[PDB]
Subunit: 419 residues, 2 copies
Amino acid sequence: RVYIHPFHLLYHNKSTLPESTFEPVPIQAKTSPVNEKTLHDQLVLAAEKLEDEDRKRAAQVAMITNFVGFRMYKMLNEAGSGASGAILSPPALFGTLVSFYLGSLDPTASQLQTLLDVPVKEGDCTSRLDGHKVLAALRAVQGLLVTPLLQSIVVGLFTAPGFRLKHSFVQSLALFTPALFPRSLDLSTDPVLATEKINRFIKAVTGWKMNLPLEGVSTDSTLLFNTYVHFQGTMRGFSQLPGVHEFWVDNSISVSVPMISGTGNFQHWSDAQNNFSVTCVPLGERATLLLIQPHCISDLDRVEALIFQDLLTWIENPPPRAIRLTLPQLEIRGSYNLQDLLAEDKLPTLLGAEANLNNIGDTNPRVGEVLNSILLELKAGEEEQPEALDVTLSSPFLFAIYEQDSGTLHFLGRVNNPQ
Amino acid sequence: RVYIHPFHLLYHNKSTLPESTFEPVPIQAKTSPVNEKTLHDQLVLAAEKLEDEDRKRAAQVAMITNFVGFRMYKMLNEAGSGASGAILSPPALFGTLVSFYLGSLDPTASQLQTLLDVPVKEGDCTSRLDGHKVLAALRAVQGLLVTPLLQSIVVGLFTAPGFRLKHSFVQSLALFTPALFPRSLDLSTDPVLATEKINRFIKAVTGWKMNLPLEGVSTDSTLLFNTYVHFQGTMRGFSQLPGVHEFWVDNSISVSVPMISGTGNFQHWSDAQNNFSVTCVPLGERATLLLIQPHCISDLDRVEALIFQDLLTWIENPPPRAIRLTLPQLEIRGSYNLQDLLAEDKLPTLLGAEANLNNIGDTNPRVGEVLNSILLELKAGEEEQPEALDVTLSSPFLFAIYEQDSGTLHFLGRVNNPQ
Ligand code: NA
Ligand code: NA
Ligand code: NA
Ligand code: NA
Ligand code: NA
Ligand code: NA
Ligand code: NA
Ligand code: NA
């Protein structure tokens, strides 16, 4: 029975030419690849010129982001995320939802806000989220995160030939990420080839090897909204160990995988109440990798449901200590359709055919997939060539990436089998 | 051989989705009338939050505005402005030209800048005017002027059915005035009726009785750009005198017209060198009416050519003195086609059929008329119910309205016959 009241993210006072449109260029059209460094430098500036007001908006956006992330993570696990584990980016999902919110009118608008856990007072427009404020706060926490440390979000907006996008909608989207690619293509004749073209396009414009889904697009789709997230962070002072080392996928089965290892002054503790432990490794001045180990493999589900389901009161802050950390080199790929997660959440028609998204384009779109896809890379900072506590991740565990100032969780996940 | 070097109005560093467009609604579509008070309050805010930088940009914009105003005033008189006299609004003309500049590409762009007396260095984009800076400085001097004192500029942008305007162009225009009315109508079948519809539209949306030209629009026109200016100022302490009083239209002919009269501490002097005199009456805290009388009627042309043709070094600043000023109540209406003034200036094809205005819409427009039309009203501040110098305007004279801080001339003109 929880409710978030993000005052600083609402409209505050209750108060016209025809809207301009364009037609996106075909998906075939030659496009320069995304520059991740450029993106990174932009994001860092947005974070560097923050007022107190901005910090307040950022703390409120973190609350909305985290809550919907935990909720959708739960939905993902209910639906089944595959063998290797699970990964979800609350910022990316939240941004996707806020983008639809900006393109939506009631009843869809209010339903989206209700899903974000913010009360709506019918008749009262000053009770509504200001999506531009929201996306501006979300950009700022993206920047705070990355103060060689990369977080790139690119959006593929794929539309049927002849569907025209509203300028205002697309300009709103740029606040989510400037790496935005509206492209048209035939979605009505060969769904599987359309997905091939989309997957080929994204790989060419990003250079990321993401292992994207192959399933075809529904033939009546006029609009797809796909969000692609690349996170890269270097583990300073970590190097790959020689050889291969047993990783227990369960109590009777092991895989022998490459491990990285390093010693630093990290935070670590054991939660007595629920019998798990946590280790925190800094990834930058504001970014923290949390690594959560259950006491035994069969307790993983209980621990995961506990720590990932709203205020992270489980995050403690002990004095750092000398820890030798050993863990699998993490190269994590995941993808889901937000449509499926919404259906799992008993909201199958929220972005359905009757959704009012009349502020997206010149006609109401028919939304096909809304994909969120991730490539997360935790690289060893040193090439493979002192008393400390040994922490060794050689059975399934949970992880989160966390921004200290706002408290935004940028990723949450579970590793069952690192490959 | 004069040149203006407005550094603060140039682009400074030498450094994409399809452009969005809309189709203007038909001229028949129901429209609320312009609110002059609302406009006035907006303009006053823009003037109230000015930095030093803004003041520098405003002083440079005044120079460009005044120079093109004097030049076009000369062209107007060469072409013949009718019987009653002449009136021209440099800000309105300048804003019209800067608006075309924003919609233009080379060679038209550079030709427009050259007409504004600012050097162009081919290959060097940092030598170009930044039209957004320019229009932002022009808005600020509009506001400074009006700190019951009104200066309203409304723009009628009339386009052939099916011609689509670029969002970016129209957004640029809003910086000139937010009172902007893009409307479509058939220009190809009945030119005279089209002008009737335009004239009817402007009167309905403004309430101003302007006595607009009746001549038809050329049949191949796809775009008309008409600017309409209403100035209203109250002469504090002036009241209409009883009866009618002789006004000499020349040495042998008089008309008996109503006069207003009032006594105040105004500035006044005689220019010995060229044998004319000037009186300055404040209209607000920053606005000044200048009234220039030749010594005799036959010298008017020489005096007009002298004072209106670049730095107003003729404007003096003596201590004010007790003056009884008597003059005709001024209700001045004027209209010209900037196309005609450009032709008079030997630039007939500058906004001609080969003009590159490809940033205005989805096709290159064919520009018909570019009208500037004025209604200037100087009302007596008191209803008709002490030693001073008598100044009485009972023969032809010149007038200007002038903003003190920037030195922008908002109007210049000549009265031969007040009605
Ligand atoms: Na606020
Ligand atoms: Na718009
Ligand atoms: Na607060
Ligand atoms: Na909004
Ligand atoms: Na400047
Ligand atoms: Na645009
Ligand atoms: Na200067
Ligand atoms: Na410009």
